[PDB]
Structure formats: structure tokens, C-alpha cells
């Protein structure tokens, strides 16, 4: 499933960052690396961005960016 599908309080593990080269390197550089848990701190309906936590850091992504990250839910 895509990361944007997780609701507030849910967790998953990154399996793949999709998109083109520039987008991928941008997202991976924020800390979205394979095999680490991502926790949803706030996915508020219709509001942008979504607030995540991974590698111990708070990171916000636009919903359309989180649409492009494949995860497996915990």
C-alpha cells in the first residue's frame, strides 16, 4: 500500500520510493529509507501536509508525495 493510506497512529515499513530520479533522491534524503518504520503522527483528512516520524525525526510530506512511497503495514 502507499504511505498516504495509513491513518493517524498507524505504522508501516518502507519497501520502495517510487517516482523519477529527482523526486526519489529528494525523498530518500529526508530519511525515507527502506526497512525503517514510519509512524503517522497526523493524517488529517483533506489537509496538507501529513506529519510522519521515522528514524526518530518528525518529517512532513504532501499527500501526493506520500502517494508515491510503497509500504507494508505493521
Residue numbers in the entry: 1 to 74
Which sentences from the paper describe this structure?
However, after ≈11 months of equilibration, crystals were obtained in ammonium sulfate and dipotassium phosphate that were further optimized by grid screening. Despite the age of the crystals, diffraction was routinely observed to <2 Å resolution, with our best datasets extending to 1.50 Å. Initial refinement revealed the presence of two molecules of only the FeoA domain (BfFeoA) in the asymmetric unit (ASU). After iterative rounds of rebuilding and refinement, our BfFeoA model converged with Rw = 0.192 and Rf = 0.236. The β-barrel is composed of five β-strands, while two α-helices make up the clamp region of BfFeoA, which comprises a series of hydrophobic residues (Phe23, Ile27, Met30, Ile59, and Leu61) that we have hypothesized to be important for mediating FeoA–NFeoB interactions. An additional 310-helix at the beginning of the N-terminus contacts both the final α-helix and β-strand that feed out of and into the hydrophobic clamp, respectively. Residues comprising both the linker region between FeoA and NFeoB are completely absent from the structure, likely a result of proteolytic degradation in the crystallization drop over time. While sequence analysis of the FeoA polypeptide does not suggest this is a common proteolytic site, the new C-terminus created after proteolysis is unambiguously present in the electron density. The overall structure of BfFeoA is similar to other FeoA proteins that have been determined by NMR or X-ray crystallography, including the hydrophobic cleft putatively involved in protein–protein interactions, suggesting that the FeoA domain in an FeoAB fusion may function similarly to stand-alone FeoA proteins.
